[PDB]
Design a protein around this ligand. Structure first.
Ligand SMILES: [C-]#N
Ligand SMILES: [Cl-]
Ligand SMILES: [Cl-]
Ligand SMILES: [Cl-]
Length: 124
């Protein structure tokens, strides 16, 4: 069983590139992070920042999670992110994603000891 933290890392961390530099980025990364194995995962954000910078957000701005839980934090600064979202012509096992690169505040739910991100809630 994957831990909540290790799963957050696999689904949401891309510290190896500063930004999606091509429209194929989401197709490539959704497959290589194993988010197209069973089904096509509809929506997924990647963060182009150090793991340490993303972990740090857990002691930044405490805000409500959109499920009404109170263990969510908004990053004080903007961060390089890529939105991956299935297009109309996506059908498992031929998953097709739209790649939208952006610079936005991230909101993560944090849990545990150490107190680390376990869910990507949104970016603003
Ligand atoms: C989505 N947590
Ligand atoms: Cl872990
Ligand atoms: Cl995996
Ligand atoms: Cl996401």
């Amino acid at each position: 069983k994957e831990t909540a933290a290790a799963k957050f890392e696999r689904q949401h961390m891309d510290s190896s590139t500063s930004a999606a530099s091509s429209s194929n980025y989401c197709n490539q990364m959704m497959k290589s992070r194993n988010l197209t194995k069973d089904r096509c995962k509809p929506v997924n954000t990647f963060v182009h920042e150090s793991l340490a910078d993303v972990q740090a957000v857990c002691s930044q701005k405490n805000v409500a999670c959109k499920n009404g839980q109170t263990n969510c934090y908004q990053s004080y600064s903007t961060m390089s992110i890529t939105d991956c979202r299935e297009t109309g012509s996506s059908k498992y096992p031929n998953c097709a994603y739209k790649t939208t690169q952006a610079n936005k505040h991230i909101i993560v739910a944090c849990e545990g000891n150490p107190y680390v991100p376990v869910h990507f809630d949104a970016s603003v």
